[PDB]
Structure formats: structure tokens, C-alpha cells
Design a binder for this molecule. Structure first.
Ligand code: NI
Ligand code: NI
Ligand code: NI
Ligand code: NI
Ligand code: NI
Lengths: 35, 35, 35
């Protein structure tokens, strides 16, 4: 598995972003890699 | 390889946790993903 | 894919280091995992 790229979906505690992106909520259920 | 999940074993500098978990020592030799 | 090990090449936003290493520029184009 790879670190998640910019603007792609991530899951805290399960599937995280490539640094320096941060996994941020974008709605009630989903998160995206932002930064 | 995947990021390490909650309460599973991690190794600093070698096998790290899924954010926002942190790899913490739990005894003399082992580390676990906590948070 | 795995997190990048100490003194190996990394790419911010694409191929990141094993914590607690940080991906730092080492010249105009390349980055390395330091820490
Ligand atoms: Ni990672
Ligand atoms: Ni981070
Ligand atoms: Ni961290
Ligand atoms: Ni992998
Ligand atoms: Ni970091």
C-alpha cells in the first residue's frame, strides 16, 4: 500500500496521507489529503 | 506494506503507524501504535 | 510500498519517511529521510 496522494481519500487510523498532507474531514463520512 | 493499525506493533524508523496513532514504547523492546 | 528508511530518498506529497524521520531537501531536486 502507498501513502495517500493530494486530494485523494484517506481514513484516520487506517489509510493515511503522504507527508506533509494531513487527513481532514470533508463531509460527515469522508476524509481527504489536504496541504 | 500498510501503515500500522491501532494497538498493533510498530518500529520507529522502520514500520510506522497510521496517523493519528503514534508509535510508543510499551516495554524494553516493543512498540505499539497508540492514540 | 513501505515507509522510507533512514538516509534513503523520499518525495514530499508522494513517498514519505518512516516516523520519526523527516523528509528534508538535500539539494535542488532531491530529499532524504533525516532524524
Ligand atoms: Ni506512511
Ligand atoms: Ni503528519
Ligand atoms: Ni505522526
Ligand atoms: Ni505498501
Ligand atoms: Ni512526521
Amino acid at each position: 500500500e502507498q501513502c495517500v496522494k493530494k486530494d485523494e481519500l484517506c481514513i484516520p487510523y487506517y489509510l493515511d496521507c503522504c507527508e506533509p498532507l494531513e487527513c481532514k474531514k470533508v463531509n460527515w463520512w469522508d476524509h481527504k489529503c489536504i496541504g
